[PDB]
Each structure stands twice: as C-alpha cells, then as structure tokens.
UniProtKB/TrEMBL annotation:
Bridged cysteine pairs (disulfide): 22-50
Domain MIR: 70-124
Protein name in UniProt: Ryanodine receptor 1
Subcellular location as annotated: Sarcoplasmic reticulum membrane
Superkingdom of origin organism: Eukaryota
Natural source organism: Plutella xylostella (Diamondback moth)
Residues of the full protein shown: 14 to 202 of 5117
Length: 177
C-alpha cells in the first residue's frame, strides 16, 4: 500500500547542516557517492542521479542462508539498493578517505556478492518497532551489514559528504512516480 515495496524506485534524503540533500552517485567513471542539495529544489523526489531501486529485501534469517514478488519492507530487513543509472549496488568500500578516520566510504560496486552491499533498516524513533511495515516517508536508520556502521552524512570543509560512520543519520525514503 503506502509502504516501501521491492522493486520501488526511491530516493534517500536527509538534512546535513540544515540543508535537505539526496544520496546520489554517478556510476561509470566515479564509483564514490555524494550528496545533492535538494533544499526546495524540486519535490521530495529529486533528479536522476538520485534514483535507487530496492532490488531485494531479506529477513535477518534469510540473509544468513543466502550468504553462503513485491515484498513489503519490514524494519529489521536487509535491503539491496541498485543505482538506476549505473546498474551497480550501493555498498561500503574498504577505503577511509574522510576526516573521521573510523568512517568508511560508501560507493558503488558491480556485483552483489558478499556483505558489503547489504543494509538493514531500523526505526529512527519509538513510533515504529522492529517487524513493522516500513511506511513511506518514515525517518529510518541504515546499517551496513559488512561494517556495523550507519549510513552517515556530515559537513567537512563546508561540503556535505556521505560515509559509513559510528555516528547515526536519519534518512527518509521517498519513492518515484
């Protein structure tokens, strides 16, 4: 219904230093992620480089077996986000190139093998709890399965970056069309 379902085209937005921004990526040459300022730019759904597809959604138990059909998303599920323009998957890179030496970079990878490309959903407040259907527009938390870090944005050098950090960021998922 009004929830996130598999195969949805969605944008992930938050607010870094007041501004509202969307998670974006280029693809072909550049494998790193970046943020787009959507602060009153367009509607909640922003432009092209901002579109990801919820390709798959597994339960905690399903993830184990799968590692070694419009499912609705449940808080606690592990999702797989494919960038539309590039057909690559949002993942946690092994390189740390931000000021925070403990954060890892988030970018794209060609294949969905291993844990680096999986992210579990978790509620941002107490208005939702594990097992519930994830409602569109809900503020949620994105946890890397591989690094045990949060999908995180922070301004460093007057620009909004995105990385995988021990510090949390609340993300809103708005679908397209």
């Amino acid at each position: 219904v009004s929830f996130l379902r598999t195969e949805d085209m969605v944008c992930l937005s938050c607010t870094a230093t007041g501004e509202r921004v969307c998670l974006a990526a280029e693809g072909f040459g550049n494998r790193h992620c970046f943020l787009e300022n959507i602060q009153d730019k367009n509607i909640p759904p922003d432009l092209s480089q901002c579109v990801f597809v919820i390709e798959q959604a597994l339960s905690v138990r399903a993830l184990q077996e799968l590692v070694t059909g419009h499912r609705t998303l449940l808080y606690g599920n592990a999702i797989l986000l494919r960038h539309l323009n590039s057909d690559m998957y949002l993942a946690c890179l092994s390189t740390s190139s931000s000021q925070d030496k403990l954060a890892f970079d988030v970018g794209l990878q060609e294949h969905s093998q291993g844990e680096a490309c999986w992210w579990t959903l978790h509620p941002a407040s107490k208005q939702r709890s594990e097992g519930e259907k994830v409602r569109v527009g809900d503020d949620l938390i994105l946890v890397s399965v591989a690094t045990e870090r949060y999908l995180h944005t922070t301004k460093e050098n007057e620009v909004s970056i995105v990385n995988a950090s021990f510090h949390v960021t609340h993300w809103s998922v708005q679908p397209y069309g």
